[PDB]
């Protein structure tokens, strides 16, 4: 019953591969529904064509700023930033999908994919999904990052949507 969404990733316009996610709507429905909707585009805006603007190897890949493309923008489907739903799910290793924010109760559209266990984020960022297929594609993306997060090639979500 948990929805599945996919990203088709490109690297300087050239296809790289597909990552798919399981969204934990059974445990974090508001947060899962935000990410699901932005991925399908059904509200008229969303992740299609946006980039992963901050990638730090061994740590995480951050994306979802579809309005300013640099970490300063993005917006939720709710017309304002929304609350931390809960912290039931923990940051337990690679593939964890978690919300970026600017402090408590400031969730918008930016998210990250962990590429290593990030225990110190528990209780600060809402975990709401996990990579299901294509972790190898996230690992390929990771190699285009750097110590300060700048990417050496443009990493884009060329297409996205809901599976099954």
CSV table of C-alpha atoms in Angstrom, one decimal:
chain,number,residue,atom,x,y,z
A,1,UNK,CA,0.0,0.0,0.0
A,2,UNK,CA,3.0,2.3,0.4
A,3,UNK,CA,3.5,4.3,-2.8
A,4,UNK,CA,6.6,3.9,-5.0
A,5,UNK,CA,8.1,6.8,-7.0
A,6,UNK,CA,11.0,7.0,-9.4
A,7,UNK,CA,13.6,9.5,-10.5
A,8,UNK,CA,15.3,9.2,-13.9
A,9,UNK,CA,18.7,10.8,-13.3
A,10,UNK,CA,21.0,12.5,-15.9
A,11,UNK,CA,24.6,13.8,-15.6
A,12,UNK,CA,25.3,16.8,-17.8
A,13,UNK,CA,22.2,15.9,-19.9
A,14,UNK,CA,23.2,12.3,-20.4
A,15,UNK,CA,21.1,9.5,-18.9
A,16,UNK,CA,22.5,7.8,-15.9
A,17,UNK,CA,19.7,5.6,-14.6
A,18,UNK,CA,16.6,5.2,-12.4
A,19,UNK,CA,16.3,5.4,-8.6
A,20,UNK,CA,13.0,4.2,-7.1
A,21,UNK,CA,11.8,4.9,-3.5
A,22,UNK,CA,9.3,3.3,-1.1
A,23,UNK,CA,7.5,6.1,0.7
A,24,UNK,CA,6.4,5.3,4.3
A,25,UNK,CA,2.8,6.6,4.0
A,26,UNK,CA,1.7,4.2,6.7
A,27,UNK,CA,4.0,6.0,9.2
A,28,UNK,CA,4.4,9.5,7.8
A,29,UNK,CA,1.4,10.2,5.5
A,30,UNK,CA,1.7,14.0,5.2
A,31,UNK,CA,5.4,13.9,4.4
A,32,UNK,CA,5.1,11.0,2.1
A,33,UNK,CA,2.1,12.6,0.2
A,34,UNK,CA,4.1,15.8,-0.3
A,35,UNK,CA,7.0,14.0,-1.9
A,36,UNK,CA,4.7,11.7,-3.9
A,37,UNK,CA,2.7,14.7,-5.3
A,38,UNK,CA,5.8,16.8,-6.2
A,39,UNK,CA,7.2,13.8,-8.0
A,40,UNK,CA,4.1,13.2,-10.2
A,41,UNK,CA,3.7,17.0,-10.8
A,42,UNK,CA,0.0,16.7,-10.3
A,43,UNK,CA,-0.2,20.1,-8.5
A,44,UNK,CA,1.4,21.9,-11.5
A,45,UNK,CA,4.9,22.0,-10.0
A,46,UNK,CA,7.4,19.5,-8.7
A,47,UNK,CA,10.7,17.8,-9.1
A,48,UNK,CA,10.8,17.2,-12.8
A,49,UNK,CA,13.8,19.1,-14.3
A,50,UNK,CA,15.3,20.0,-10.9
A,51,UNK,CA,18.8,19.2,-9.8
A,52,UNK,CA,20.7,17.7,-6.9
A,53,UNK,CA,22.6,20.8,-5.9
A,54,UNK,CA,24.6,19.5,-2.9
A,55,UNK,CA,26.4,16.2,-2.9
A,56,UNK,CA,29.0,15.2,-0.2
A,57,UNK,CA,30.5,11.8,-0.7
A,58,UNK,CA,30.1,9.4,2.1
A,59,UNK,CA,27.4,11.6,3.6
A,60,UNK,CA,24.3,12.4,1.4
A,61,UNK,CA,22.9,13.8,-1.9
A,62,UNK,CA,20.5,16.7,-1.4
A,63,UNK,CA,18.0,17.9,-4.0
A,64,UNK,CA,14.4,19.2,-4.4
A,65,UNK,CA,15.0,22.9,-4.7
A,66,UNK,CA,12.9,23.3,-7.9
A,67,UNK,CA,12.4,27.1,-7.5
A,68,UNK,CA,16.0,28.5,-6.9
A,69,UNK,CA,18.1,25.4,-7.8
A,70,UNK,CA,20.7,26.1,-5.1
A,71,UNK,CA,19.3,25.2,-1.7
A,72,UNK,CA,17.5,28.5,-0.9
A,73,UNK,CA,14.1,27.7,-2.4
A,74,UNK,CA,11.5,25.0,-2.9
A,75,UNK,CA,8.0,24.7,-1.6
A,76,UNK,CA,5.6,22.1,-0.3
A,77,UNK,CA,2.2,21.2,-1.8
A,78,UNK,CA,0.4,22.7,1.3
A,79,UNK,CA,0.9,26.4,0.5
A,80,UNK,CA,3.5,27.0,3.2
A,81,UNK,CA,6.3,25.1,5.0
A,82,UNK,CA,4.8,22.3,7.1
A,83,UNK,CA,5.4,20.6,10.4
A,84,UNK,CA,7.7,17.8,11.4
A,85,UNK,CA,5.2,15.0,11.2
A,86,UNK,CA,7.1,12.6,13.6
A,87,UNK,CA,10.5,11.1,14.1
A,88,UNK,CA,9.5,7.4,14.2
A,89,UNK,CA,11.9,6.4,11.5
A,90,UNK,CA,15.6,6.8,12.1
A,91,UNK,CA,18.7,7.5,9.9
A,92,UNK,CA,19.9,3.9,9.9
A,93,UNK,CA,22.1,3.7,6.7
A,94,UNK,CA,22.5,4.2,3.0
A,95,UNK,CA,19.3,4.8,1.0
A,96,UNK,CA,17.3,6.6,3.7
A,97,UNK,CA,15.2,9.4,2.3
A,98,UNK,CA,14.8,12.4,4.7
A,99,UNK,CA,13.5,15.9,4.6
A,100,UNK,CA,15.8,18.9,4.6
A,101,UNK,CA,14.7,21.9,6.6
A,102,UNK,CA,15.7,25.2,8.2
A,103,UNK,CA,14.9,24.3,11.8
A,104,UNK,CA,11.9,22.8,13.5
A,105,UNK,CA,8.6,22.7,11.4
A,106,UNK,CA,10.0,24.2,8.2
A,107,UNK,CA,9.6,21.4,5.7
A,108,UNK,CA,9.3,22.4,2.1
A,109,UNK,CA,10.4,20.3,-0.9
A,110,UNK,CA,14.1,19.7,-0.3
A,111,UNK,CA,15.1,16.2,0.7
A,112,UNK,CA,18.3,14.2,0.9
A,113,UNK,CA,19.3,10.6,0.3
A,114,UNK,CA,21.8,9.3,2.9
A,115,UNK,CA,24.8,7.3,1.6
A,116,UNK,CA,25.9,6.4,5.1
A,117,UNK,CA,24.4,6.1,8.6
A,118,UNK,CA,23.7,9.6,9.9
A,119,UNK,CA,22.6,9.0,13.5
A,120,UNK,CA,23.2,12.7,14.4
A,121,UNK,CA,20.2,13.7,12.3
A,122,UNK,CA,17.7,11.7,14.3
A,123,UNK,CA,15.0,13.9,15.8
A,124,UNK,CA,15.9,16.8,13.5
A,125,UNK,CA,15.0,15.6,10.0
A,126,UNK,CA,11.8,13.6,9.2
A,127,UNK,CA,12.7,10.2,7.6
A,128,UNK,CA,9.9,9.2,5.2
A,129,UNK,CA,11.2,6.8,2.7
A,130,UNK,CA,14.0,4.6,1.4
A,131,UNK,CA,15.6,3.7,-1.9
A,132,UNK,CA,14.2,0.5,-3.2
A,133,UNK,CA,15.9,0.1,-6.5
A,134,UNK,CA,18.9,1.9,-8.0
A,135,UNK,CA,21.1,2.5,-5.0
A,136,UNK,CA,23.9,1.9,-7.4
A,137,UNK,CA,22.7,5.0,-9.3
A,138,UNK,CA,22.9,7.1,-6.1
A,139,UNK,CA,26.4,5.8,-5.7
A,140,UNK,CA,27.3,6.9,-9.2
A,141,UNK,CA,25.8,10.3,-8.5
A,142,UNK,CA,27.8,10.6,-5.2
A,143,UNK,CA,31.0,10.5,-7.2
A,144,UNK,CA,30.2,13.9,-8.8
A,145,UNK,CA,30.1,15.6,-5.4
A,146,UNK,CA,32.9,17.1,-3.4
A,147,UNK,CA,34.0,18.0,0.1
A,148,UNK,CA,32.1,21.3,0.2
A,149,UNK,CA,29.1,19.8,-1.7
A,150,UNK,CA,29.6,21.5,-5.1
A,151,UNK,CA,28.9,19.1,-8.0
A,152,UNK,CA,31.4,18.8,-10.8
A,153,UNK,CA,28.7,18.0,-13.3
A,154,UNK,CA,25.0,19.0,-13.4
A,155,UNK,CA,22.9,16.2,-11.8
A,156,UNK,CA,19.3,16.4,-12.9
A,157,UNK,CA,16.0,14.7,-12.3
A,158,UNK,CA,15.2,14.3,-16.0
A,159,UNK,CA,11.8,12.6,-15.3
A,160,UNK,CA,9.9,11.4,-12.3
A,161,UNK,CA,6.6,9.9,-11.3
A,162,UNK,CA,4.7,7.1,-9.6
A,163,UNK,CA,5.4,3.4,-10.2
A,164,UNK,CA,2.8,0.6,-10.2
